Design a protein around this nucleic acid. Structure first.
Ligand SMILES: Nc1ncnc2c1ncn2[C@H]1C[C@H](O)[C@@H](COP(=O)(O)OP(=O)(O)OP(=O)(O)O)O1
Ligand SMILES: [Ca+2]
Ligand SMILES: [Ca+2]
Ligand SMILES: [Ca+2]
Length: 341
DNA sequence: GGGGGAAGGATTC
DNA sequence: CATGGAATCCTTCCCCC
């Protein structure tokens, strides 16, 4: 089995560059403005020019403007990036029937029944990067290995605008030297727990009694990591389907007032239903982000689909439940619909 | 004991 | 200071044969 992972370079920003080439060259910062104060919000992402000075996804626009006060700042245009993505995604389909679209800019392809070896996989890679570059003018990074996991790691090493292969020879070397924290699905919280257990490299998971690993990080993560170090990780490329659709917004100011919060919530439901586009959910959740950035949600499943009408009143109940049960203020409020018929 | 769904949350990207 | 959409997994209940 041969997997080929494709990850579009600094996507949102590069899309902005494509639409207005004049940007090419200057540091571009695509940010999500939260309507609170001036320039309140976080950075969705930035092109590498800006990344060099520490302006990256996650940080306050405010901190960004402080570092690069003269960089170009754009308001994230999701639908646009989304449509561009869908196109780039379609091209890959022309390279493999089996395609797993991981995110707005990631895809895995099972190029087993199309290639015989890694030399040919690499070629197919270059051929792909080139296609997308002509058709859309979008630079992407390619990763190629024996399984999805190492395929991604491959790309992680090669970006930006790179193409790398991780042959069975290197796969073994990495299992031995790759910092466990660079393994997908291993965030800070998990990586730190792994340190305390002494586990610092994929292999290290072998030097520990299973059960203790399962207790410290969970059975799922355990079996996953272990199957990686044992070189037996082999999950197939599966077409994934949307199981949930929601939307959350940020309020001008924190609140615990049902009448002041209702609007925001009702707005979230509006967009949510619009995105359902003929999809009917039997489950609704009200999600709330407390002033101290904590997250609490209250949901409910129904034996029948949900009308917007229903969703409206039901969501007010759950919000009331949140308020009655959580003394803190609410910073962000939203809804999430799932369990589509 | 144990299947199985629901709810609230944790963690990742 | 701190956006935001969505998947997967974990723990705890709960109904019940
Ligand atoms: N914190 C975030 N908030 C909103 N959108 C985000 C955030 N982080 C990432 N994204 C989105 C926009 C990114 O361009 C996109 C695709 O891949 P991702 O690796 O996350 O970013 P990227 O393309 O900018 O980085 P890279 O060029 O290093 O691969 O995901
Ligand atoms: Ca990317
Ligand atoms: Ca990505
Ligand atoms: Ca990591």
């Amino acid at each position: 089995m041969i997997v080929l992972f494709v990850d579009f370079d600094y996507f949102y920003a590069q899309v902005e560059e494509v639409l207005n080439p004049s940007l090419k060259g200057k540091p571009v910062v695509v940010c999500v403005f939260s309507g609170r104060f001036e320039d309140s919000g976080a950075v969705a992402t930035a092109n590498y020019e800006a990344r060099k000075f520490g302006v990256k996804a996650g940080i306050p626009i405010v901190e960004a403007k402080k570092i690069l006060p003269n960089a170009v700042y754009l308001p994230m245009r999701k639908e646009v990036y989304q449509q561009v993505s869908s196109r780039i995604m379609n091209l890959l389909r022309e390279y493999s029937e089996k395609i797993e679209i991981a995110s707005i800019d990631e895809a895995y392809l099972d190029i087993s029944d199309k290639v015989r070896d890694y030399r040919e996989a690499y070629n197919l890679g270059l051929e792909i990067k080139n296609k997308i570059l002509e058709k859309e003018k979008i630079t992407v990074t390619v990763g190629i290995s024996k399984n999805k996991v190492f395929a991604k790691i491959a790309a992680d090493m090669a970006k930006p605008n790179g193409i790398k292969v991780i042959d069975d020879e290197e796969v073994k070397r990495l299992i031995r030297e790759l910092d466990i924290a660079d393994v997908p699905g291993i965030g800070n919280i998990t990586a730190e727990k792994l340190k305390k257990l002494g586990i610092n490299k994929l292999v290290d998971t072998l030097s520990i009694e299973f059960d203790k690993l399962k207790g410290m990080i969970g059975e799922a993560k355990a079996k996953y990591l272990i199957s990686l170090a044992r070189d037996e990780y082999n999950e197939p490329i599966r077409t994934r389907v949307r199981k949930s659709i929601g939307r959350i917004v940020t309020m001008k100011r924190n609140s615990r007032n049902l009448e002041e919060i209702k609007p925001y919530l009702f707005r979230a439901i509006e967009e949510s239903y619009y995105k359902l586009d003929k999809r009917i959910p039997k489950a609704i959740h009200v999600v709330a982000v407390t002033e101290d950035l904590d997250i609490v949600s209250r949901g409910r499943t129904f034996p029948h689909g949900i009308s917007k009408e229903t969703a409206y009143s039901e969501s007010v109940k759950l919000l009331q439940k949140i308020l009655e049960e959580d003394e803190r203020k609410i910073r962000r409020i939203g809804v999430r619909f799932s369990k589509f018929i």
